[PDB]
Amino acid sequence: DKDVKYYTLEEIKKHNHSKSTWLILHHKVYDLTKFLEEHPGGEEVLREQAGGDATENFEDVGHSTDARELSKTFIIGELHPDDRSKLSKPMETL
Ligand code: HEM
């Protein structure tokens, strides 16, 4: 999974189902849906932080390098650039 489709926080918080198990690991949007059962450890752990900050876990365990790699193929997007260093503005329409 190799692209950066800049997604909005709402979007990430709208993929927490089962076939879109996303999460935010270091201001980045990952997708481990096809990795849920393909993850050496569990799957439900990726759901406990689905569309949410699993970074606490990722670091608590202090993951191996081979895992740091699948991260690169699990990114599907990044936190919007209007929402990386602000997260505080209106929208306005017409
Ligand atoms: C980029 C996303 C992730 C990738 C690519 C990934 C990949 C891996 C790999 C390759 C291992 C090593 C297997 C072993 O030690 O036998 C591992 C272990 C593990 N992972 Fe992940 N992982 C990811 C995210 C997560 C997250 C967010 C959680 C928790 C919510 C988690 C919890 C664990 C646990 C519990 C283990 C077993 C070893 C231990 O921590 O004692 N992983 N992971």
UniProtKB/Swiss-Prot annotation:
GO terms for cellular component: cytosol; endoplasmic reticulum membrane. The keyword Transmembrane applies. It is a single-pass membrane protein. Residues 4-80 form the Cytochrome b5 heme-binding domain. Coiled coil: none annotated. One of its GO terms (molecular function) is enzyme binding. Its main location: endoplasmic reticulum. Keywords: Acetylation, Electron transport, Endoplasmic reticulum, Heme, Iron, Membrane, Metal-binding, Microsome, Transmembrane, Transmembrane helix, Transport. It is found in: Endoplasmic reticulum membrane; Microsome membrane. The modification N6-acetyllysine is found at K2, K5, K14. Heme binds at H39, H63. Belongs to the cytochrome b5 family. Cytochrome b5 is a membrane-bound hemoprotein functioning as an electron carrier for several membrane-bound oxygenases. This is Cytochrome b5. The chain holds residues 6 to 99 of 134 of the full protein.
